[PDB]
Structure formats: structure tokens, C-alpha cells
Amino acid sequence: GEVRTIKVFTTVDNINLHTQVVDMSMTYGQQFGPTYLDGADVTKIKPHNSHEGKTFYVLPNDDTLRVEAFEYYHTTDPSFLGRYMSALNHTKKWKYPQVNGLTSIKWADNNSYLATALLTLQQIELKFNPPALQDAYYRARAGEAANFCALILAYCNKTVGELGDVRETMSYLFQHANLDSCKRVLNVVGQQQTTLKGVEAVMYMGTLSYEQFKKGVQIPKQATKYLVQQESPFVMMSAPPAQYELKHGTFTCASEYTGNYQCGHYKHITSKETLYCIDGALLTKSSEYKGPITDVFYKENSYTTTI
Ligand SMILES: Cc1ccc(N2C[C@H]3C[C@@H](C2)N3)cc1C(=O)NC1(c2ccc3c4c(cccc24)C(=O)N3C)CC1
Ligand SMILES: [Zn+2]
Ligand SMILES: [Zn+2]
């Protein structure tokens, strides 16, 4: 029968577009391989008249596409693009309410960890290295966060509907950020000093209190570890969830966690004119706070001990 054609664009990064002429009598998969339209898998579908001029994602199947994908995402995992598209097909349907100019996410698909991470990322100073994260983060800050959320799911190898860990999520994203100038000097009292750089310089697991880290924490005979010097724009202090008192103006933000390991619920606590509890789309305020906290973030620039 008749052979009709339309013009479309293919891409791996939505920056470099490659004009294609498509045969409407064949499926996209027969012509391109796995093919996606705004996240939806159209590999098994034939071109529709309405697809003319639209942009489709394809898997990198030639060296030009391979280079474009790597330069944009900073990954060689061949499953990455398909996982990113599968997540986007869901996150494009989430809602992203603004809370005091912070983009949150209405609860869906056990995404409380992602809303809490997204809110945190808008409150600390971070520069991503992969252009894909740079571009999507800028959009997310302005309220259009579906692509950023799908990329986070793909980078962290999380499926939509799976509850993830905020500390683990932030840690992996930090591996894609420019933290090269961050430095931490510790003394453990023999008396021994160590210097950490990069992501290890901004994370700690064992106490929520930055002040306690400065004064000294006991670690295994028992010794005292304390912070000698900190050069970073923030620090993330974490510990297994425990009841904790947060005081206005003494922290930047924090992760509240209720429930059991791997199956509970996160909320986000931030300090503004009072304490805000952002719970996806829901906001409550209170002058005081006591509750189960598992991460606290503190802004920083340069700290030097007086010990
Ligand atoms: C919410 C979530 C999602 C995923 C995961 N996972 C852990 C390992 C496996 C893969 C994914 N990776 C953990 C949590 C979780 O529940 N994470 C916290 C937690 C709760 C209760 C805890 C702990 C402890 C140590 C560290 C974290 C933690 C602990 O000792 N208890 C009793 C932050 C909430
Ligand atoms: Zn949840
Ligand atoms: Zn000792």
C-alpha cells in the first residue's frame, strides 16, 4: 500500500536534534530501535500525523549519539536513558506545588524522599557537573521539576513507587557535583589528624548535631573525634532516626522520618521566620519542634576550631 512519510527529530539529550524522515508504514522501533515521546515508549507504535515535527528520544546506537549521551549525562550505563524515560513518564504527571518559593512534590508513588531531597537541594549551594542535571535543576528551582525528578530516579537506580533514602540519594547526587574545594580536618585523640576532601568532607553519619561534632564525639578503648577545620558551603549530619529538638535559626533544614526502616515517611523541616514542616503539598508552622530526625543540613563557609 501507500508509503507515507513525516519529518521528526531524534535526540539523546534534547539539545542536539537530528532530522529524520520516517516511513509511516513501519513502527518507530523498526526504524530507530527503542524510541520515546516525552517519556512514553513508542517503539511498537506507527507514526501518527500529529507526530510531525516532534522530538523523540532514541538509544545511542552510533558513535555520534554515544558521545552526545555521555557528554550530557556523564554515564555509560546503556540502561540509563530507558530508565530515565520510564521515570519521566510518571514524574511528568506529578504535581509540584510551590511552598514559599520552594518547589515541593505532591505525594505520589512513595516519593516523600524525593520531595524532601528536592526541597533540600533548593536550600544548599551545589553545582552539578553533568549538563543534564545542571539544566534540569535550574528548571526544577523555577517550578518545573519533572525532568529533575526523573533524572534523580535514573541516576540512583530507583523505580517509581520505591521508597528511597534521602541521605543515600543526596550522597549519590553529590558524586555528580563539583565539591573539589570542600575540605574537612579531623583530630582523633595518641592524637591523630586526617584531612578529607570532596563528598567525604561534607557528610557525616553518627550525630545530627554540628555543635557536638565541633565539641567532640566518642568513637571506638574510646577516643574523641572532633572537627578541626571545615571549608564547604554546607554540611550534612546524619544518624539513625531519633527524637530531636530543632531550634529556629540554628540549622538550615532537616529530614524527619517516621516509621520503620525502608517503609516509612519523610517530611522536610526548614527554618525561616519560624519552623516550617513541609509534607509534600502540606505546610504547617510551629515555633518549636521535637520529632524523629535523621538528617540535618547546616550552611557553612569556613570554620576553624578554638580547641
Ligand atoms: C527510607 C529508606 C529507603 C531505602 C533504604 N535502603 C537502605 C539500604 C538498602 C538500600 C535502600 N540501601 C533505607 C531507608 C531508611 O529507612 N533509612 C533511614 C533509616 C531508618 C531506620 C534506621 C536506619 C538505620 C541506619 C541508617 C538509616 C536508617 C538504623 O539503624 N535504623 C533503625 C533514614 C531513614
Ligand atoms: Zn513516602
Ligand atoms: Zn585509642
Would residue 148 be called left, alpha or beta, if left means φ above 0 and alpha means ψ between -120 and 50 degrees?
alpha
**Is the CB of residue 70 less than 8 Å from the CB of residue 62?**
no
Which cell is 176 given? 555528580
Which atom of ligand 1 lies nearest, measured to the CA of 167?
A: 33
Query: Would you give the DSSP letter of residue 54?
Result: -
Q: Which helix (H) or strand (E) holds 99?
A: strand 98-99
How far apart are alpha carbons 295 and 262 in whole angstroms?
15
The residues facing 23 across adjacent strands are 5
> Residue 282: which residues within 8 A CB-CB, separation 6 or more?
none
Please choose, from the candidates 76, 70, 42, the residue with its C-alpha nearest in 3D space to the C-alpha of residue 56. Answer: 42
Would the CATH topology of 87-174 be identical to that of 183-304?
no
Burial label, 16 (beta-carbon count in 10 A; 0-12, 13-18, 19+): middle
Phi (first) and psi of residue 57, to 5 degrees: -85, 140
Please list, residue by residue across 254-286, b when 16 or more beta carbons sit within 10 angstroms of its beta carbon and e when fewer do. Answer: bbbbeeeeeebbbbbbbbeeebbbbbbeeeeee
Which cell is 252 given? 538550615
> Residue 274: which residues within 8 A CB-CB, separation 6 or more?
248, 285, 286, 287
For helices 112-121 and 146-155, angle between their N-to-C axes, nearest 10 degrees: 110
Of the ligands numbered here, which is closest to the C-alpha atom of 168? 1
How far apart are alpha carbons 241 and 296 in whole angstroms?
11
Distance 104 CA to ligand 1 centre (A): 22
Which atom of ligand 1 lies nearest, measured to the CA of 257?
A: 34
Pocket test for ligand 1, best of 262, 267, 268 (most atoms within 8 A of CB): 262
**Is the CB of residue 12 less than 8 Å from the CB of residue 69?**
yes
How far apart are alpha carbons 118 and 152 in whole angstroms?
10
Sign of CA dihedral 151, 153, 154, 155: positive
Phi (first) and psi of residue 174, to 5 degrees: -60, -30
**Is the CB of residue 253 less than 8 Å from the CB of residue 271?**
yes
Of the ligands numbered here, which is closest to the C-alpha atom of 106? 2
Please choose, from the candidates 75, 140, 59, 66, the residue with its C-alpha nearest in 3D space to the C-alpha of residue 102. Answer: 140
| Experimental technique used to determine this entry | X-ray
**Is the CB of residue 86 less than 8 Å from the CB of residue 93?**
no
What Å resolution does this PDB entry report? 1.7
**Residues with C-beta atoms within 5 A of ion ligand 3:** 221, 223
Look at ligand 1, atom 26, and give the residue with the nearest C-alpha.
240
Distance 243 CA to ligand 2 centre (A): 20
Whether residue 259 has its Cβ less than 6 Å from ligand 1: no
Query: Would you give the DSSP letter of residue 79?
Result: T
How far apart are alpha carbons 188 and 60 in whole angstroms?
50
How far apart are alpha carbons 248 and 240 in whole angstroms?
22
Q: Which helix (H) or strand (E) holds 106?
A: none
How far apart are alpha carbons 1 and 291 in whole angstroms?
69
CATH of domain 183-304: 2.60.120.1680
**Is the CB of residue 7 less than 8 Å from the CB of residue 24?**
no
Query: Would you give the DSSP letter of residue 28?
Result: H
Query: Would you give the DSSP letter of residue 73?
Result: H
Q: What are the Cα distances from residue 285, in Å, to 198, 256, 277, 282? A: 35, 14, 6, 10
Whether residue 266 has its Cβ less than 6 Å from ligand 1: no
How far apart are alpha carbons 50 and 34 in whole angstroms?
19
Please choose, from the candidates 117, 202, 199, 106, the residue with its C-alpha nearest in 3D space to the C-alpha of residue 153. Answer: 117
Which atom of ligand 1 lies nearest, measured to the CA of 264?
A: 1
For helices 131-141 and 63-73, angle between their N-to-C axes, nearest 10 degrees: 50
For helices 146-155 and 166-174, angle between their N-to-C axes, nearest 10 degrees: 90
CATH of domain 87-174: 1.10.8.1190
> Residue 116: which residues within 8 A CB-CB, separation 6 or more?
166, 255, 266, 267, 268
> Residue 213: which residues within 8 A CB-CB, separation 6 or more?
204, 207, 226, 227, 237
How far apart are alpha carbons 296 and 269 in whole angstroms?
9
**Is the CB of residue 277 less than 8 Å from the CB of residue 288?**
no
**Is the CB of residue 173 less than 8 Å from the CB of residue 148?**
no
Which cell is 165 given? 533514602
Sign of CA dihedral 197, 148, 296, 127: positive
Query: Grid coordinates 531524534 are at which residue?
Result: 10
CATH architecture of structural domain 5-61:
Roll (3.10)
Q: Residue 68 CB: number of other CB atoms within 10 A?
A: 18
The residues facing 96 across adjacent strands are none
Whether residue 10 has its Cβ less than 6 Å from ligand 1: no
**Is the CB of residue 94 less than 8 Å from the CB of residue 108?**
yes
How far apart are alpha carbons 118 and 120 in whole angstroms?
5
The residues facing 130 across adjacent strands are none
Which cell is 219 given? 568513637
Q: For the chain, what are the domain ranges?
A: 5-61, 87-174, 183-304
Please list, residue by residue across 98-133, b when 16 or more beta carbons sit within 10 angstroms of its beta carbon and e when fewer do. Answer: ebeebbbbebbbbbbbbbbbbbbbbbbebebebebb
